[PDB]
Design a protein around this nucleic acid. Structure first.
Ligand SMILES: [Mg+2]
Ligand SMILES: [Mg+2]
Ligand SMILES: [Mg+2]
Ligand SMILES: [Mg+2]
Ligand SMILES: [Mg+2]
Ligand SMILES: [Mg+2]
Ligand SMILES: [Mg+2]
Ligand SMILES: [Mg+2]
Ligand SMILES: [Mg+2]
Ligand SMILES: [Mg+2]
Ligand SMILES: [Zn+2]
Lengths: 48, 230
RNA sequence: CGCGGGGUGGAGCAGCCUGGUAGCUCGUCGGGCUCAUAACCCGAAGGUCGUCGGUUCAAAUCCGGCCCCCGCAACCA
RNA sequence: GGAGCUUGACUGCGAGACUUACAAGUCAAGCAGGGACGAAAGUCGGGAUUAGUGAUCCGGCACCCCCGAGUGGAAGGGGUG
RNA sequence: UCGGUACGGUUUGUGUAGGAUAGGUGGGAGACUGUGAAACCUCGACGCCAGUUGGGGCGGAGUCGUUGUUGAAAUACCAC
């Protein structure tokens, strides 16, 4: 019910972060700005 | 039956795959055999057109013409029509040209209109119904380049579109051409189909291809040759 | 994780491969007959055909994404 | 307790401590990159704090492109998450 | 004797609207009669309104879509 989701960059597609959401309160994929170390800056991040 | 058809059918072999040069070499010997018409190409693809992203659609610039009249009336206002009479469109007008066709001489092939004038020109489809001369974005005739898209109709931009059962049925032009001049069309058209291969096309892409008329039989062609048409 | 099907009227199940009507069974309601709607008989209510989108003039049927069950074969340090 | 904008529930690190048989556990000023909020000062490496967890081995996936059994590749392995 | 597979020939397809032209796509008015046309016979094939008919038997030269639908539009005829 609280799965471990991974967040991938929207440019280089590297899976930089892993976290947890609720599968029922947030039934679709997260979107967060996170720091991408490959791009060297903040990019957008969906799930996989 | 059809004694004129068995005579060509006693000529072309089934168990052999011919060159693209020999394919037009018997297309001329079919258009001499039969009454002349368009040379047809039936491509059998290795895609599945029921998935969305394996759908194949596009056009082709045949460098020897598709053998077509391409009479064009251009429904545009301002310089958009004026850039078409300088393009080589013989019947060029305005909101006046709405009136000159619906009453008489509805004899043209395409109507490339501006998106601002699509209301008043769209009533001419009530006499251009069964012939499809209405302005259509699906045929490349509704855009912002309403001027030089007439030149696409003149040179022979043939639109293709794959069917339900993964077949491209396709033309290269009238059969009054040279044999080596048809392979120039036939070479620069397969490669246009080779452009539009999706990444998810499982298997062999151009499985089977054949060359026919609308009067004679088909010709088995070898899909191995994609470059050496010269 | 792969595969291999399934969701459709209160319950059950066809139609799905192959595109044009949503039906059958039971339950219920109402009426009839009757010791007894036990049975028998007639009419009707009950449906975005799991949800989103997509393709076609038109999709319960076909494609894809999603929830949701059922199997099998693994994986199981 | 309420509200506005947000994603620091960061990446590269870390002087110096706490606890401790060992393995572990815990705290950390400050430095740089790229950020959020704020007029600024500043504050932010999840949550008032202390539970919500499982060593090694063996594998899986993603990236880096380090090794590649004559050589060029590949197989397999290695690193990082 | 019952199939499976590779490939050829034959044939199949009927909401409503409506040519009875009744699977998709392509273009297609000339393919159409000694390859002996149409009428006419009826050994049959199937079934949902008129058979679309692989009946191969009878003929002595059309078995034309621009009109007037199936998105609608051809579907005579040809490749697939
Ligand atoms: Mg929420
Ligand atoms: Mg976290
Ligand atoms: Mg340290
Ligand atoms: Mg900073
Ligand atoms: Mg500021
Ligand atoms: Mg800090
Ligand atoms: Mg061990
Ligand atoms: Mg080697
Ligand atoms: Mg490797
Ligand atoms: Mg590191
Ligand atoms: Zn990135």
């Amino acid at each position: 019910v609280r799965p471990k989701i991974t967040l991938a960059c929207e440019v280089c597609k590297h899976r930089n972060y892993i976290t947890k959401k609720n599968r029922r309160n947030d039934p679709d994929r997260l979107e967060l700005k996170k720091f991408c170390p490959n791009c060297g800056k903040h990019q957008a991040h969906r799930e996989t | 039956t059809s004694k004129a058809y068995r005579a060509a059918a006693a000529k072309v072999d089934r168990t052999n795959l011919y060159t693209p040069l020999q394919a037009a070499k018997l297309a001329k010997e079919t258009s001499s055999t039969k009454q002349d018409a368009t040379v047809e190409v039936a491509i059998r693809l290795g895609v599945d057109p029921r998935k969305a992203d394996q759908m194949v659609r596009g056009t082709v610039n045949l460098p020897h013409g598709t053998g077509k009249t391409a009479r064009v009336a251009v429904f545009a206002v301002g310089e958009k029509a004026d850039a078409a009479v300088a393009a080589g469109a013989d019947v060029v007008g305005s909101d006046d040209l709405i009136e000159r066709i619906q009453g008489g001489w509805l004899e043209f092939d395409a109507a490339i209109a501006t998106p601002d004038q699509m209301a008043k020109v769209g009533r001419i489809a009530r006499v251009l119904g069964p012939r499809g001369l209405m302005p259509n974005p699906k045929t490349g005739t509704v855009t912002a380049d309403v001027a030089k898209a007439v030149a696409d109709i003149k040179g022979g931009k043939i639109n293709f579109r794959v069917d339900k059962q993964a077949n491209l049925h396709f033309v290269i032009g009238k059969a009054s051409f040279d044999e080596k001049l048809l392979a120039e069309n036939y070479g620069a058209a397969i490669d246009e189909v080779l452009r539009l291969k999706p990444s998810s096309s499982k298997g062999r892409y151009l499985k089977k291809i054949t060359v026919s008329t609308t009067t004679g039989p088909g010709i088995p062609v070898d899909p191995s040759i994609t470059r050496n048409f010269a």
